[PDB]
Design a binder for this molecule. Structure first.
Ligand code: AZZ
Ligand code: AZZ
Ligand code: MYR
Ligand code: MYR
Ligand code: MYR
Ligand code: MYR
Ligand code: MYR
Ligand code: MYR
Ligand code: MYR
Length: 582
């Protein structure tokens, strides 16, 4: 408007305003103390208020970036603490803002943030709700300088809502701790997703991204016209290019403009944007991003007509291959919400691979008159797995099932950090329950969304601590082949069973006194180690020793003494195993 500051304050509101400014500065000045950021926020906020009362007061005409940069440069110890970053204060705005971007650190050498006791958290919440929430928001923000601010804000309110509900409950911990875990996990998945897209836009390219967006937007807005979808994909692409550069304000405006365009064209995109569009800026785009799939028109012909029989097909394909394959993808995508984008892309690639060789023959219509046959095996696969796993996830519960993955993966690539094997296994497990719950129509898309992050996380580690090239092969394979690659790893047969060591299996009674998350992650570390020492063991074998061990501990937690039991009735089990498996 006449003043940017004013305008952002007016529609964001004072409370949200204060919290975003805090997250902003917390992400650059990651080293300064909370108390300092509060002075800052309050200052900036008093100024904002100045521009709201008189939208023409001194300096209110300045742009946010400018103002932001000016405040960053007033920090007395900028150069002493951030050193080179302080040099940014010498450039002329555009360059300055760009300079600040590139100096923001991502590996803040800061201590892991620990979860204090429920009683103290609850007490802290109660005594001073704002300092408590804003303090932790500041803590999460300075350790994650790239986590999109608004989204972090959105998480805070969930944290606030969980304390609010739990701290005044009967069994606080049992109420609170699980919700805090659902937020930690969820919070990590979100961080991972946004870095993955920005990475993909880098690797795979702007085109591949678009292909991905068309598939995704068509499943969500099946009723819209290819032209309409296509318009949204071009915009969606920019939004994410700019956003991936890292400027919070630019990124925010792009998401806002798009969300507004979508709401002003509702009846041309979806009939599911009712709610979201009534919401205020902040929540609007976010809301839209999680909207449900509109229903597809019952009418809808079939792909056969326009993509196989129809004359002009090779003609349409040569005039605009990209737009053409875009329409294929679009038409298929909107008819199949239950497919994972990536699956939709193999289909699209395959179709392309056929028209490329087929429109080169003397009579194509014959060459490609059976493409849809090549599609069946490609679709059946991801489906059949989803079934094999989700069904198995029944016989056994999450934990007992994570123990199946655990063994299966340790035997594929046994030369991998045992604690990385435990994390990945457990993570796959959670993916199994977060999804297998959904109906046979949201499964594949869910898995795709969660398996991806888990897979990238596992590649990032493998990238930093390489070991097995097979994984490397999968980690450097194509966007569309990553998963199948992993799903095709066979048990490794070159493995040299790990040197024995009874210590790795030496246990004590200190475990009859540990929470689930504890007991588990230990019964699982031995299980993994047990496979690396005798990978030639079978499921009947391990499903046996897993019992001779489990029900063994219950016998030491049922004995007057323990230490002896956990060594006496132990070792007795070790030998009874180092024999029954050799
Ligand atoms: C990245 C991220 C982490 N967290 C969680 C994970 C962190 N612990 N660990 N590991 C915890 C630190 O308070 O917050 C969150 O709530 N939101 C987020 O966006
Ligand atoms: C669609 C989607 C996007 N994101 C990313 C993309 C958003 N940025 N942009 N553009 C970012 C917003 O926090 O989160 C996400 O974390 N989960 C999702 O489901
Ligand atoms: C905008 C974010 C506001 C966050 C307020 C967070 C309060 C978090 C307590 C977190 C305890 C986490 C324990 C853990 O991750 O292991
Ligand atoms: C002086 C510091 C000013 C910081 C202002 C931050 C404003 C953030 C607005 C974010 C709007 C997001 C809209 C959306 O995601 O759809
Ligand atoms: C203003 C944004 C409205 C977005 C509605 C999005 C439905 C999105 C499925 C999106 C996958 C998006 C990836 C990205 O945005 O970078
Ligand atoms: C208006 C935009 C139309 C875009 C049409 C895109 C068609 C993309 C086919 C992409 C195949 C990608 C295969 C791969 O990335 O490995
Ligand atoms: C020790 C490192 C192990 C890394 C394991 C990566 C495993 C990826 C598995 C994907 C499995 C899909 C299974 C299924 O669909 O039924
Ligand atoms: C404990 C792990 C449970 C895993 C269940 C995995 C279901 C995976 C479905 C994968 C579909 C992949 C589709 C694709 O890659 O194109
Ligand atoms: C040298 C002998 C090493 C034995 C290692 C045994 C590891 C057993 C893990 C058992 C996990 C059982 C889980 C369950 O029963 O629900």
């Amino acid at each position: 408007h006449k003043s940017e500051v004013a305008h952002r304050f007016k529609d964001l509101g004072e409370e949200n305003f204060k919290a975003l400014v805090l997250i902003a500065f917390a992400q650059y000045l990651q080293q300064c103390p909370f108390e300092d950021h509060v002075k800052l926020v309050n200052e900036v906020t008093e100024f904002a208020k100045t521009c709201v009362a008189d939208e023409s007061a001194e300096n209110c005409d300045k742009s946010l970036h400018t103002l932001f940069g000016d405040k960053l440069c007033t920090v007395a110890t900028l150069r002493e603490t951030y050193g080179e970053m302080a040099d940014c204060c010498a450039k002329q705005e555009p360059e300055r803002n760009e300079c600040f971007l590139q100096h923001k650190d991502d590996n803040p050498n800061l201590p892991r943030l620990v979860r204090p006791e429920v009683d103290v958290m609850c007490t802290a919440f109660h005594d001073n709700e704002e300092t408590f929430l804003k303090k932790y928001l500041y803590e999460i923000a300075r350790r994650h300088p790239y986590f999109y601010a608004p989204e972090l804000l959105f998480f805070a309110k969930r944290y606030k809502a969980a304390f609010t509900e739990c701290c005044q409950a009967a069994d606080k911990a049992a109420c609170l701790l699980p919700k805090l875990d659902e937020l930690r996990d969820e919070g990590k998945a979100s961080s991972a997703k946004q870095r993955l897209k920005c990475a993909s836009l880098q690797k795979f390219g702007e085109r591949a991204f678009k292909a991905w967006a068309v598939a995704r937007l068509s499943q969500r807005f099946p009723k819209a016209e290819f032209a309409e979808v296509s318009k949204l994909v071009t915009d969606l692409t920019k939004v994410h290019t700019e956003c991936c550069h890292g400027d919070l304000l630019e990124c925010a405006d792009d998401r806002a403009d798009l969300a507004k365009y979508i709401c002003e064209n509702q009846d041309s995109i979806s009939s599911k944007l009712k709610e979201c569009c009534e919401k205020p800026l902040l929540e609007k785009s976010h809301c839209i991003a999680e909207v449900e799939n509109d229903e597809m028109p019952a009418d809808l012909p079939s792909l056969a007509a326009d993509f196989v029989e129809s004359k002009d097909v090779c003609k349409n394909y040569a005039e605009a291959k990209d737009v053409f394959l875009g329409m294929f993808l679009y038409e298929y995508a909107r008819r199949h919400p239950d497919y994972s984008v990536v699956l939709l892309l193999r289909l699209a690639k395959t179709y392309e691979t056929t028209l490329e060789k087929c429109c080169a023959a003397a009579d194509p219509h014959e060459c490609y008159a059976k493409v849809f046959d090549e599609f069946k095996p490609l679709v059946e696969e991801p489906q059949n797995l989803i079934k094999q796993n989700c069904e198995l996830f029944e016989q056994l519960g999450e934990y007992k099932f994570q123990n199946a993955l655990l063994v299966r993966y340790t035997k594929k690539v046994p030369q991998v950090s045992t604690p990385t094997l435990v994390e990945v296994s457990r993570n796959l497990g959670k993916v199994g329950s977060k999804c297998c719950k959904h109906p046979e129509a949201k499964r594949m898309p869910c898995a795709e969304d969660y398996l991806s992050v888990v897979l990238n996380q596992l590649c990032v580690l493998h990238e930093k601590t390489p070991v097995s090239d097979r994984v490397t092969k999968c980690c450097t394979e194509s966007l569309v082949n990553r998963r199948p690659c992993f799903s095709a790893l066979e048990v490794d047969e070159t493995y040299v069973p790990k040197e024995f060591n009874a210590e790795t299996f030496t246990f004590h009674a200190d475990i009859c006194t540990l929470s689930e998350k504890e007991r588990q992650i230990k019964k699982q570390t031995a299980l993994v180690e047990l496979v690396k020492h005798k990978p030639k063991a079978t499921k009947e074998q391990l499903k046996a020793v897993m019992d001779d061990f489990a029900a063994f501990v219950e016998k030491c937690c049922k004995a007057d003494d323990k230490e002896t039991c956990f060594a006496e009735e132990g070792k007795k089990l070790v030998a009874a195993s180092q024999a029954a498996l050799g």
